[PDB]
Design a protein around this ligand. Structure first.
Ligand SMILES: [Cu+2]
Ligand SMILES: [Cu+2]
Ligand SMILES: [Cu+2]
Ligand SMILES: [Cu+2]
Lengths: 682, 678
C-alpha cells in the first residue's frame, strides 16, 4: 500500500532509513547517496546487519516487506532548513522555524506524484531536523489529492517525550531490555507528577496534562496552521474557529476551577508584572536531552533576542500592537495593508479578528496589528533564557503539543479571549427571528445513563486507567511493546432523550444544539447571567429530521460532534481524525459533593443553519465538527460558533430561564454532576 | 586478592543493570540464589538464566562465573529502602548520609571478604544505586581483607554526573548502529552551559573540568563527614578540609584575575538575592530529573522537604554562625561536656574544621551546628525548597557536581573567611620556625622539560583526550562508548635547585614550593596579604642533603599535589588513588599575554618537619595525606603562608630576605590557545 511506504518514514524519527522499520518488518532499499556522510562508508555493513537479508531478518517471520526507493534526477535544495540541526529543539512559535517548515511542506506538495514524494521524503528524512521533517510531511500528506487516504500516525507515536513523564520512559528501558515482550508490564504514570497537592493549581492537572487534551491542541493547529502554503492555511472560518476552540477550552477549564475551589482565571494583561504562577514540566527532549525548562515562581518576562534561534521580539512590540487592535475593535472596522476598510461588527467579524490576533498568514494587515498571540507564547517560553546566553531551549509554552500543560497558557489565552469578547459584546442581541422556531416545539429534555434503570439528569465522572504502546516513538530501544499506564478523567455513558413536536406540514432538517451552563463559583455563590453565558460549553450539535407530529429523539453521548473516540486519540486515518476533543473529557470533572448544571437544548431552523454541506457524522471522520469543522469543507453551521451564546442577551434577562422563556424550541434540564474518587480499568 | 577484585567489579559497574545480567561485556557472570532476584524478576528467573547466563548465546576466553552463597539470614535494609532504587541521592542530606553510614557498617561488619560479596550481591539490586556504590566503595577501602581491591571511579559508575546528556544521547545512536571496530568518539564541547555573554563562563575550564570534580568527590569519599567511626576519624581531616578548599579557592581566584574577573564575593548574606546564575545541563539517567538550574537573582528559601526527610532554615545558619565566631574570638571552643578546647594553636584549625563542615567527630554538634553542609542544601534546593514541585537537587547537592557552580566558590569563600579569622589570630612564624642555618638555597630555577627548554617560563594549552564511559551506561549497546573532551594542560618542566649545606652530617630536609600571584584583574599589584592568601602549593618533598653543595632536579610530574591522568580517568588501585588534584591542572590557565608569578621555594628543617611516617599512591599527600597513615608534614598545612607575616613585611621579598633557605624566582605563565591531542 501507499500508506506502507510512508509509514516507515513516519516513525522512529532519529533512526535512519537503513534500519528496519515496523518491528523489523518494513525495509528500505536506498540509493547509496541517500545515506548521510557518516553512515555511507559502512553502507554495505549496514545492509548486511540491518537489511532484508540480514541474519536478524531471518527469524522475524517466526513478512518481510521491502520498499524500493528510486534515485532522484536531481537532489533538492535543503539549505533553507540546514541551520536547524537534526537534533536541535524545534518551536512552531519561532517564525524562522515556521518559515523552514513552510518551504519543506511546499517542496513536498510540489512533487509531481505521490511516488516521487516518497523518494524525496526518504532523501530528506535523515538529513533534516526530525520534528521539522515529521511536521512538514504530515501537513503535505493531509493536503495532497493523491494521498487523501494515506494513514498518518499521531504525534504520540512520533515524539512521546512531549506527552510522557521521562521518568516513566527511562524505567521502561529496563523493562524492555530485560523482560521478553511476552511477559512485559505497563510502566504506570502518576497523577501527582509536576506538583503535589500543596500547589492548588495541581487540581487542574487532570485537565492541563491530559494526553488526549494536548494531542487535540496539537492536531487542531496541525489542521489549521498559522503559516505554510496558501491552500494549507486558507480554510473555512479558521480565524473564528481559532477563537472559538480556545474560548471553549477556557470555559471548560474555568468551570472545573470553580469545582475544585479555584477562582476565576486572572488574564495575563500586564507583561511587565511578575508572573505569579510557576510550572515545572519535567518533560525532556530525547533528541538533545534539553528539557522543557521550568518557570520558577514570580519571574519577570524579558525581551527575547536569541540569535542562535534567529528569534527576536520585545515586550514593547506587543504593547504597541495591542492598542491598534483594540482601536480597530472599538471603531467597528479594521484596515488592510492596501487601505480597504474591513468591517468587524458582523457575524464574520470575529473571523477577521481571529487571523489578526493569532496571527495567521491570511491576516489583512500583518504590520499594523502585528502578532500578539504567537509572540506572547515566545516571551513566556523563553523567560528562563531570553537571550540564549545559557543555551537552553523553549519551555512548554514554546511547544504546540505541550503548551496546555502550563497554567500560564490559560491566563494568556484569557487575555486573548477578552479581546475577542470585546468584539462580540458590540454585536446586537439575537432577535425573535434568529432564536425562535415557530413550527417546532421542544416538549421534553432528559439525560439518562445508558443502562437498565439508569439515573435521570445525573452525570457521573471517575478515574479511568488506560494503556498505550509507545513503541514507535522510542529510538534505539528494545523490540516489542513499550506499554505505559496512565490515569485520566472519564464519564459514565448516557443518552439525551428529546421529545419534539412539529406542527409543520413538511419535514425539517433542523439542528439540535446542546449546551451545559454552570450555576456557581468556588464560593458556591451563583454566577451572574453573563458569567453563565460566557461559560456555556457545547456538548453536541446535530441535524434531525423532524416529521410532523411527535418525535422521540434519543442521542448517544458517544456520538458527540465535539469529541472523538479513544482509538482516534491514542491509536495507530489522516491527522484530521487526530483533531477533536477527547471523548473521556466530554463532561467537566466536578466534585464528590455534586455540581448542578443547566443542561440547555435548542432546536434551530435549518433555513438559518445550512451552508450547503453534506456529511455523515457516523461516517469517515466527520464526528468532531464542533472544534475541527469538516475536512476540506465548510463549517456546516452558518451561525456564529457558540450560537446562541456568543452574543449578549436582551435587557431584563437575568436567568437561563429568562433567556429561553420566550422560545418554545428551547428547554432546560437540571442535571447533577458528581465525581466518584475511584479508578476503573479500561 | 586479584580474583577478589573480580567478584566486586561486577557489583561496581552498570548500577541499574541487575546482577543477573552479564557483567564486563558478557565476560563476568554471577550464579545467584533464587531469592536474590527482586520481586519483579523472581517469577521469570529461569527465562532470565536461559537468556543471560554464562552458557547463553551471549574474546577467546571461557567466561568467569562467580558463585554467590545464600545468606544465613536476610539483612534488614529498611533503613535505606525509603530511598527508592531510582531516586535522587544527596550526600548533603543528613538522612542520606545516615543511610549510607548504616549500609557501610553492615558491610564492615561482615566476618570475611567473601561473605561481604554475598551480602553486597543481595543488597545491590534492592537499593538506591548511588547509595549502594558509595557505601560499598568506602567499605572496600577500609576493610583490611580488601585492602588491595581495585574499585572503579565514579566516572565509570555514573557518567551522567560529568557529561553533557546531549553528548551521551548521541552516543546511544553511535553504539546501536556502528560496530565497535568502526566507532567514533562523541566530542564534548567546552562551551555548553553558557556563552561568552556570561563572564563566569571564563572559569568553565576550571569549574566543569571532569578531573577537578573527580578530585572533589574522591577527597570527600576518603574523608567523609559521616559513617562508622574508623571511617571518619583520620589524621587532621578537619584541617585538611580547610586546606584543600582554601587551595581550591586560591587557584580559582588566581585565574579569575587572569580572565579579567574580580575577587570572589563571599556569600555572607543568605537573604539577599543570589546574583550568579548557573544552568548545569546535567541529567540523572536514573529518573531523568535534572540538576535543576538556578536562574539569575533568586532568593534562598527555608528548605522543608518531607519526602527527603530534609529540613533546614536560613535562621539556623544565622544562629550557628555567631556561636562559631564567638569560640574563635574566645580562643577556645567548648565541647558538649563543657571541656574547653583551645583554638589559638597549630591544631586549632583542625578542631574548627570538624565544627564548621561539620563532621561526626565535631566536639559539639548542637552548639555549632552544621554550617557548611546546610549551606549546600539551601542553595541546592533553592528552586524547590518545600518539595512542592517534586524536583531534585541542583549541582550544589552533589559532591561530584558542586564545583561546577560559580556559587560554590562564593559559599566556600564565606567558609574560608571563618577559618582565616582563626588563622589571623595566630602569632607570625619566628626565626626558629622559618630559618635553616646549616642550609642555603643559592639557585632557584624552572626549565621546560625539553632540549633548549625555556627557563622560568610556564606554558599552558588545550589538550584533547578520550575516555571509555562503557561501564556506567545502562541498557545501551555493547562495546566501547568513547567520548572526546578538551581540558587545560601544561608543558612538562623541572625544578633546578642548588642547595649548600655547611652541616657536618647529612640532613633529610624538606623542599616546599609555592606559586604566588602579583596582580589583580586591573593589572594592579596585590598587597602582600593578598599575595600570601593566594599562595598555592605546587610541590613538597624531602631531600637528602649531603654536606656541601647539592644539585636538585625535580620533575613536575612528581608533584605531591597532583596525580597522573591514568589515576583520574583510568579503570580496573583503591579509591584513595582517585583522590588527588589532576596533573593537567598543576598550573593556573593564565592568559595569552602572560602572567608573572613569584615562584617560592623553601628548605625547612627536618627536626620540625617530621611526623614518624612515592611509588604507591603516596604522590598526592598535599590534598589527600597518606592512606592509613598520618600527614607526613608536622607543620600546619600551607606552611609557611598559613599565618600572617611580621609587621614590617610589605613585599614577598621582605618575607624571604632574612632567610637564606628561601629564594624567589620570577616566572611567566602564558596560555596557548591551541588544541594538542594526547
Ligand atoms: Cu491553541
Ligand atoms: Cu496560544
Ligand atoms: Cu569539598
Ligand atoms: Cu562545600
Amino acid at each position: 500500500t501507499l500508506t506502507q511506504k510512508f509509514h516507515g518514514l513516519l516513525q522512529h524519527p532519529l533512526e535512519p532509513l537503513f534500519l528496519p522499520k515496523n518491528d523489523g518488518t518494513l525495509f528500505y532499499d536506498l540509493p547509496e547517496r541517500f545515506l548521510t556522510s557518516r553512515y555511507s562508508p559502512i553502507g554495505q555493513n549496514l545492509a548486511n546487519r540491518f537489511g532484508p537479508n540480514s541474519p536478524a531478518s531471518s527469524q522475524v517471520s517466526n513478512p518481510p516487506t521491502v520498499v524500493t526507493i528510486k534515485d532522484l534526477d536531481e537532489l533538492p535544495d535543503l539549505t533553507f532548513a540546514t541551520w536547524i540541526k537534526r537534533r536541535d529543539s524545534f518551536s512552531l512559535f519561532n517564525p524562522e522555524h515556521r518559515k523552514a517548515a513552510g518551504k519543506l511542506t511546499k517542496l513536498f506538495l510540489d512533487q509531481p506524484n505521490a511516488d516521487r514524494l516518497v523518494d524525496v521524503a526518504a532523501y530528506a528524512r535523515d538529513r533534516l531536523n526530525a520534528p521539522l521533517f515529521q511536521y512538514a510531511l504530515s501537513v503535505a500528506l493531509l493536503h495532497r489529492p493523491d494521498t487523501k487516504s494515506v494513514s498518518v500516525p499521531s504525534l504520540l507515536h512520533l515524539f512521546p517525550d512531549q506527552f510522557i513523564d521521562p521518568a516513566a520512559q527511562v524505567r521502561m528501558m529496563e523493562e524492555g531490555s530485560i523482560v521478553l515482550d511476552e511477559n512485559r508490564m505497563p510502566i504506570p504514570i502518576p497523577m501527582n507528577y509536576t506538583a503535589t497537592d500543596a500547589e492548588p493549581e495541581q487540581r487542574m492537572a487532570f485537565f492541563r496534562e491530559d494526553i488526549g487534551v494536548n494531542l487535540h491542541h496539537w492536531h487542531w493547529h496541525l489542521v489549521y496552521p498559522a503559516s505554510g502554503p496558501p491552500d494549507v492555511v486558507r480554510k473555512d472560518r479558521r480565524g473564528e474557529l481559532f477563537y472559538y476552540m480556545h474560548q471553549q477550552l477556557l470555559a471548560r477549564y474555568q468551570i472545573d476551577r470553580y469545582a475544585q475551589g479555584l477562582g476565576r482565571i486572572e488574564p495575563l494583561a500586564n507583561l511587565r508584572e511578575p508572573v505569579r504562577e510557576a510550572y515545572y514540566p519535567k518533560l525532556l527532549r530525547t533528541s538533545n536531552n534539553r528539557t522543557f525548562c521550568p518557570r520558577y515562581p514570580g519571574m519577570t518576562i524579558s525581551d527575547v533576542a536569541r540569535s542562535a534561534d534567529r528569534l527576536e521580539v520585545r515586550i514593547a512590540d506587543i504593547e504597541s500592537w495591542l492598542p491598534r487592535v483594540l482601536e480597530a475593535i472599538d471603531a467597528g472596522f479594521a484596515v488592510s495593508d492596501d487601505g480597504v476598510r474591513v468591517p468587524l461588527d458582523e457575524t464574520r467579524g470575529i473571523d477577521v479578528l481571529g487571523n489578526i490576533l493569532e496571527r495567521s498568514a491570511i491576516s489583512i494587515n500583518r504590520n499594523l496589528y502585528g502578532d500578539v498571540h504567537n509572540m506572547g507564547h515566545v516571551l513566556l517560553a523563553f523567560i528562563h533564557d531570553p537571550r540564549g546566553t545559557y543555551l537552553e531551549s523553549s519551555g512548554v509554552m514554546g511547544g504546540v503539543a505541550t503548551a496546555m500543560r502550563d497554567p500560564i497558557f490559560y491566563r494568556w489565552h484569557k487575555f486573548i479571549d477578552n479581546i475577542f469578547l470585546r468584539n462580540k459584546a458590540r454585536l446586537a442581541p439575537y432577535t425573535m427571528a434568529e432564536l425562535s422556531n415557530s413550527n417546532v416545539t421542544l416538549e421534553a429534555l432528559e439525560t439518562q445513563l445508558d443502562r437498565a434503570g439508569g439515573a435521570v439528569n445525573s452525570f457521573v465522572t471517575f478515574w479511568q486507567r488506560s494503556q498505550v504502546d509507545l513503541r514507535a516513538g522510542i529510538d534505539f530501544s528494545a523490540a516489542g511493546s513499550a506499554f505505559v499506564s496512565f490515569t485520566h478523567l472519564q464519564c459514565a455513558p448516557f443518552v439525551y432523550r428529546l421529545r419534539i413536536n412539529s406542527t409543520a406540514r413538511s419535514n425539517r432538517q433542523d439542528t439540535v444544539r446542546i449546551f451545559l451552563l454552570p450555576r456557581q463559583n468556588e464560593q458556591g455563590r451563583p454566577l451572574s447571567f453573563e458569567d453563565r453565558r460566557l461559560l456555556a460549553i457545547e456538548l453536541d450539535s446535530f441535524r434531525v429530521n423532524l416529521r410532523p407530529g411527535m418525535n422521540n429523539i434519543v442521542r448517544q453521548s458517544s456520538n458527540s460532534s465535539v469529541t472523538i473516540p479513544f482509538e482516534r486519540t491514542f491509536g495507530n486515518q489522516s491527522r484530521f481524525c487526530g483533531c477533536g476533543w477527547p471523548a473521556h473529557m466530554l463532561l467537566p470533572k466536578g466534585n464528590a459533593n455534586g455540581v448542578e448544571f443547566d443542561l440547555f437544548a435548542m432546536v434551530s431552523r435549518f433555513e438559518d443553519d445550512n451552508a450547503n454541506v453534506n456529511y455523515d457524522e457516523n461516517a469517515g471522520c466527520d464526528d468532531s465538527y464542533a472544534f475541527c469543522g469538516l475536512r476540506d469543507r465548510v463549517y456546516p453551521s452558518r451561525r456564529a460558533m457558540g450560537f446562541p451564546f456568543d452574543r449578549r442577551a436582551s435587557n431584563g434577562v437575568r436567568s437561563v430561564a429568562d433567556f429561553v422563556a420566550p422560545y418554545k424550541n428551547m428547554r432546560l434540564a437540571t442535571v447533577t454532576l458528581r465525581f466518584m474518587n475511584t479508578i476503573i480499568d479500561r
